Structures are given as C-alpha cells and as structure tokens.
Amino acid sequence: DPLPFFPPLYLGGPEITTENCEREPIHIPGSIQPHGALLTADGHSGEVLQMSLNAATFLGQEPTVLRGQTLAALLPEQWPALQAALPPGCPDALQYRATLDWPAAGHLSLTVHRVGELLILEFEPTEAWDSTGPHALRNAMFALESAPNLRALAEVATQTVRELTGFDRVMLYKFAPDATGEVIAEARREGLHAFLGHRFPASDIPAQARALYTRHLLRLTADTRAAAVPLDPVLNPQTNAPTPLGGAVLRATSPMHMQYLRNMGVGSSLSVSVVVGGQLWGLIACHHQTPYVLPPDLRTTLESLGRLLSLQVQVKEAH
C-alpha cells in the first residue's frame, strides 16, 4: 500500500532524501533520458502538445516549429494505424510500434501508448541489423520448459537473458512478503563480484516503485551519468497537470536511484517485472558496466520472456 506522492520539483515539491524517498513522484518527472525524443499528442485530434527539448536532434526540426501540428499532417502513413491500435480507454500498457526513415544512419523506432486522452510518442534511433526475430523468444522457451524446479528455472532464465542481451550482469531478484529481496539466480561476466544469495532492504525498491512495476513491466537507465531532458511545456495542457510517463521507457529515472547505480559502479541498468496472480513476485534485474541502449525489439522480447517466466513460476509454485 504506497504513500501518496509529494509534488514534483518543478511544482515546488520537496527535495528527495533518504527520509522521504517513498514519496518521490517517480512517474511524473517532466523529463526524459537523452538517447531518444518524446512528444505528447491529443488522442482525438493528433495535435502535438508537448515535446522534449532535444526533439530537433532526432526529428530534424525545432520544438517551437512542431508543436501544434497534427500527427495527421506529420505522420500521414502511421496516424490511422496508431489511432486504430490505441482506442480511447485501452490499457496504458498497450503499445503501437512502427519503424520510420530519417536523415541519418539506421531508422527511428516509434513507440506509442495512451494515457487517458493523451498519446505519448517515443522516438529512438535503431540500426537495421538491430532487428530481433520471433526465434529469439521461441528458441529460449525450450530450456525454460525443461528446468525441473523453481531454482533451476531461475538459473536458466538469467543465463538466457544474458545470452540474448550481452549484459554484464543479469539477476533474478525475488521479493519476500516484507518487501525485502534476495538475488536467487545470477549470470555474470567472469570476475565480477557475485550478488547471488545476497539480501536487500525493502527501501531499495520503495513502495511507489513496486506499485508502478506492477503495471508497467519494463524500465531502464541507458546511461547512469546522463542528464535528463525537460518536456516543454512541462504540464499537459489538457489537464494543466503533470504528464504520467510510467508507460514510457524514455521516462527520466529517479535521481536517487541513478546515484544508487553509480555507487554500485553500474553504467546502464534495465529490469523486467515478474508479476504472479497480479502481485509483483520479483524482477529480472540487469546491469552493464558502461552506457548501453538495448534495442526496442530486444526490450519487447525481454518483456515477453518476463510474462512467460511469470507463468512458469506460477505453474511450479502450484506443486
């Protein structure tokens, strides 16, 4: 049962310390990570309402010039499909995904979801060979299916995720009923210190984070030293209230957790929820020693692997 959040910093809210960090409003930071661009749009008209300040770098033109244009004008070949894919009232975790061409090498990956009457559009560069087929997940199901018990399933799952991603460290972090956690399986680069069997306090993943991770199953920090980029305007004009960014992997990470990562020597972090009968059972928690952007198709593969593992855990715990 999480505490109510305090206002964010840009609404004059308090600075976040170790005494009050269960109240940080981590879903509404008003800013994104700088490896991509974000726009928000009205869900019926398509009118562009908010843009990240770096939008020109990715889109080829200025925020001041794109704001107020409609997606029917800007994205004539995707706007109908996007509308159809995310009708009003659909789940905020449902996504639309398209690949677009741009001035530069590779393409732009476009990911869109709906929160209330607002469409949230994320653009991130992707290379062409950075395609992942459905075989990656398909072939991986095999070793997960043959694991004979829960711990063997956890060990195969961390090894499969490390093989798919190349991450330096991949853990399965399981929550206890008091919300403390334990690393129950770990695949890691030879010579990295082991976290296997280590337990952590509940405060390391505070209650409002555990709530958010029950609904939006994947989040990441691509570069634990990168400054966030503001959305402008920072509040959603539809509501004159903060924009919920829980559903956007580009959402800026809590500064408090960015510090926690830098203290562990982590350059890039990503985790996928394992949700069992609607409760958060644990996380697939990954680190890399340097900044790294896992490509969008691999992320989506990992999400699916989390849902598959959640079912296999749920099967075995009933035994």
**175-214: which residues touch ligand LBV (CB under 6 A)?**
181, 195, 200, 203-206, 209
With binding defined as CB under 6 A, does residue 147 bind ligand LBV? no
Half-sphere exposure at residue 175, Cβ-oriented, CA atoms within 13 angstroms: 22
In sequence order, which ranges of 60-176 are alpha helices (DSSP H)?
63-66, 71-74, 79-85, 134-146, 150-165
Cβ 285 to ligand LBV shortest distance, Å: 4
Contacts of residue 131, Cβ cutoff 8 Å, sequence gap at least 6: 297
Give DSSP secondary structure letters for 158-181: HHHHHHHH--SEEEEEEE-TTS-E
Among 10, 260, 291, 304, binds ligand LBV (CB under 6 A): 260
The neighbour count for residue 173, using CB atoms within 10 Å, is 22
Annotated binding residue 90: no
With binding defined as CB under 6 A, does residue 301 bind ligand LBV? no
Question: With CB under 6 A as the contact rule, which of the stretches 18-26, 50-58, 119-127, 139-147 interacts with ligand LBV?
Answer: 18-26
Which residue's CB comes closest to ligand LBV? 21
Q: In what order do the strands lie in the sheet with 31-32?
A: 31-32, 229-232, 48-52, 37-42, 118-126, 107-115, 96-100
With binding defined as CB under 6 A, does residue 310 bind ligand LBV? no
Q: Which is nearer to ligand LBV, 221 or 312 (CB)?
A: 221
Q: Which is nearer to ligand LBV, 33 or 109 (CB)?
A: 33
> Which residues would be at the binding site for ligand LBV (CB under 6 A)?
18, 21, 24, 26, 181, 195, 200, 203-206, 209, 219, 221, 253-254, 256-257, 260, 269-271, 283, 285
